[PDB]
Structure 1
Amino acid sequence: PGTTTDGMDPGVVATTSVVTTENASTSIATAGIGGPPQQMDQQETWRTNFYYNDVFTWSVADAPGNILYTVQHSPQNNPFTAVLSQMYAGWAGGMQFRFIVAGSGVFGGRLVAAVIPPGIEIGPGLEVRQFPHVVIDARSLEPVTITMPDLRPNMYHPTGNPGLVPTLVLSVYNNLINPFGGSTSAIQVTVETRPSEDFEFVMIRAPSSKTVDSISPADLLTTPVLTGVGTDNRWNGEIVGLQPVPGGFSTCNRHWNLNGSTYGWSSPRFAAIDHDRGNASFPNVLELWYASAGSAADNPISQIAPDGFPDMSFVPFSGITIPTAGWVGFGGIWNSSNGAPYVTTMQAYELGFATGVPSNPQPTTTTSGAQIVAKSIYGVANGINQTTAGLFVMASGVISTPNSSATTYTPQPNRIVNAPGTPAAAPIGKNTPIMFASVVRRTGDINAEAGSTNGTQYGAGSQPLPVTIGLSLNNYSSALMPGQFFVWQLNFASGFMELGLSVDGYFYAGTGASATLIDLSDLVDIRPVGPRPSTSTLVYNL
């Protein structure tokens, strides 16, 4: 019966014009520069069965020619070839894909598939129906299997740096049609994989040896990073949610990219902020410290500001009323002659960026022509006037607030200070940049964590700290071409969604225009998917 499918059954074998005997024979001949092939026993359980890769949705609103699914050729597309690549230096050959369509006998509609050769851009203007292709009906009962050959300009694929490869695309041929109309408007398709008969590894290597270029940043984002261990890269607090930003934003301090560089002035850690010379005065009085941005000689990362200095905008205040949504830190003033601290100046201070603070303090979001200012939000015991004086504050802060209430998430996009030349994160179609949210203490109610009737206060950061560390230590320069994401699937008990990482280090979600926070308390596991075009909408099925 066609209603039952075993684990080794390919179903219907469909061929396009790219599968020829020349390609297979040439592949096997030229792979011989690396010696005899390894792991070729064709009777092993890891090689004869099909194993799961993905599942996608076909809706009645998808127009003809719209792309539904793409995959780039790699040994990372099968769970066991990925494990076995940890002990070899090269690979070659192709891989089979099995599609199962979960339709019914009354539906109508057709799909189409083709193999796209290297050097061609994958995007909405790609005309699949003008390549050699196969057409598949929506009523198909048996599985349909399609083979992607190894079309490569190299003799073999180096494990770290493979080079050009082909890709497989599936799109809509004719619209899915339901003759009854009504509420049922979509079906699902599942994809599985197994290696072709010419797949092979070459040249054994010690598992502890390091390839020159890393294969994939899949290991950075694992389940504990978002389920209770990782903390954000601005406030150092427990990540509990994802905040979309429909407008766009930019961030450079303690933010690394995939070329192993930062534009900021901080390290991936939280420590003490120390600068040796500043201006102190008090014209229960408020102390006032500042210096000129761009003269931090002790910092080898960047001469812009002392390591750990927050990248928010100073909000002015005076008299009685204390400021709002400022960055608060603990410490005081110390003498720069011997290092002793002036013991009477200890308080909580509000730190930030500003311009012209001797005469008129105006917030600025630029690092050029600005100055860095610290002001005590409360009165000190005994103030000090000095010409040269140091500063000492911790890197973990809280949020100033006048009353017991809570405000929006801090900081807001226009409050972030950036250096000249920093790339920005902007929407691409329905995909929107996001920030990572963590609950942060505030000075208006110092016993509120979660469930508090006074409200919940959130602090947002651009990257999880373990990701920032991993990007600062390794080099991922060859994993992503421009215009691609690296995608993970986030599984919940009720729904799932996808996260994309760009070459500039910003994370993305397919939220469109919504601005509500997404909660992570019911997350189960995280699974990697691999490179995909950034024009393709990221799934959001929560």
Structure 2
Amino acid sequence: ISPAGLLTTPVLTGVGNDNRWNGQIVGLQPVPGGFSTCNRHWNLNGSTYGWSSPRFADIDHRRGSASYPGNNATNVLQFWYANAGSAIDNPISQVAPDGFPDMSFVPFNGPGIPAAGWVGFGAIWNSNSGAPNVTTVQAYELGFATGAPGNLQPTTNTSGSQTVAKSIYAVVTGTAQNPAGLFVMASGVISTPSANAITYTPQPDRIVTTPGTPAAAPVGKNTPIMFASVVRRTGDVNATAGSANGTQYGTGSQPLPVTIGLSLNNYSSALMPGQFFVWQLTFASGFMEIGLSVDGYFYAGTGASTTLIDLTELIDVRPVGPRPSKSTLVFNL
């Protein structure tokens, strides 16, 4: 089966959403330093090194530890954590619950809001009954850390880590239960300290991976890219593309339609070592080539550039075929 069908015009012209934020892909973000990603990311040999299925549903862990500071539970910041490896009900991997975001935790004390955190809506729930603790509904920052619960530090390696959650605003009444469940919707927003947008999120040094995860490195002038979508932010929930407060981008390593396709069929014989599968992206006034490596990462021939490539004027996606990764991908925009 040829990889050609993985990338069609609708995937990049409005229909395809990225595999981290589930947002509508509108840009290609070059990463000249390279990056890694495993969560909800598949390769051409039918494998993922992450812990999530290719879908956005919810994040569910039955046996964490919930806590809050002080002697009064009223209007506190709710905390929750579990150890990496303790998501033993997850058939993909037991590292973390299916859908838990692959981002290092941004610690915060309050009342200020953390910058560049993955934030989702949810609650603590009763491990024995499944009933949500209705006084704990809030927006929570989720991420990977060490040192929980008292001395939190970010980490980008799942080995020895903890999956932590902390409400960014006060809950009605906090809970201190162990065990305690966490339930959070899997489609997130980006936390910001003010109404202003921040840089694209996550930056490469924030992405959490499992041991064995291959990194994407540049090949000549061919540079790994992420797929950019306009993602809501906590500082200004009404802002979209072109906001006077700035446009907020969230990035993913793959379009989810590609991830799904890679999870359904094996493409191991499609490419020889050193090759990309190439598609041509044709715009109103030019074109570019995009390449897919056997590790599942996409590339553009943009060299050292960090400028976002706008897909607003993209007209068509057409397959080219396997090409040597040593050849510069055409960039005629």
Q: TM bucket by the smaller chain?
A: over 0.9
2:257 aligned counterpart, secondary structure: helix
1:250 partnered with 2:36: yes
Which position in structure 2 is the counterpart of 1:172? none
TM, length-normalised to structure 1: 0.60
Which position in structure 2 is the counterpart of 1:406? 197
Which position in structure 1 is the counterpart of 2:258? 467
Question: What letter matches 1:281 in structure 2?
Answer: S
- Select which of 46, 52, 55 maps to 1:269: 55
Spell out structure 1 runs of 4+ moving beyond 3 A: none
- In the TM superposition, 1:230-379 aligns within 5 A as 230-283=16-69, 284-379=75-170
Distance 1:532 1:383 in 2: 57
Distance 1:376 1:491 in 2: 44
Q: CA deviation at 1:451?
A: 2.0
Which position in structure 1 is the counterpart of 2:292? 501
Which position in structure 2 is the counterpart of 1:444? 235
- Give the direction of change, closer, same or farther, for the CA distance of 1:532–1:319 in structure 2 (3 Å limit): closer
How many pairs does the alignment contain?
Answer: 328
Which position in structure 2 is the counterpart of 1:128? none
Per-residue deviation, residues 203-249 of structure 1 (Å, max 9, x unmatched): xxxxxxxxxxx2x1101111111111110000000000100001010
1:228 partnered with 2:19: no
Question: What letter matches 1:326 in structure 2?
Answer: G
Q: CA deviation at 1:296?
A: 1.1
Provide structure 2 residue ranges, at least 5 long, that are not aligned to the other structure: 70-74
1:219 aligned counterpart, secondary structure: helix
| Alignment RMSD | 0.8
- Select which of 257, 279, 292 maps to 1:488: 279
Question: What letter matches 1:438 in structure 2?
Answer: S
Q: CA deviation at 1:358?
A: 2.5
Per-residue deviation, residues 22-65 of structure 1 (Å, max 9, x unmatched): xxxxxxxxxxxxxxxxxxxxxxxxxxxxxxxxxxxxxxxxxxxx
Q: CA deviation at 1:312?
A: 0.3
Q: CA deviation at 1:320?
A: 1.6
- In the TM superposition, 1:76-95 aligns within 5 A as none
* Structure possessing the higher relative contact order (Cα contacts under 8 Å, 6 or more residues apart): 2
Distance 1:397 1:421 in 2: 26
Distance 1:335 1:507 in 2: 42
Larger Rg: 1
- Select which of 315, 325, 332 maps to 1:524: 315
Distance 1:452 1:377 in 2: 24
Which position in structure 1 is the counterpart of 2:173? 382
Per-residue deviation, residues 76-112 of structure 1 (Å, max 9, x unmatched): xxxxxxxxxxxxxxxxxxxxxxxxxxxxxxxxxxxxx
* Identical columns (%): 83
Per-residue deviation, residues 371-414 of structure 1 (Å, max 9, x unmatched): 11100111111111112110100000101111111110000000
Native 8 Å contact 2:196 2:246 kept in 1: yes
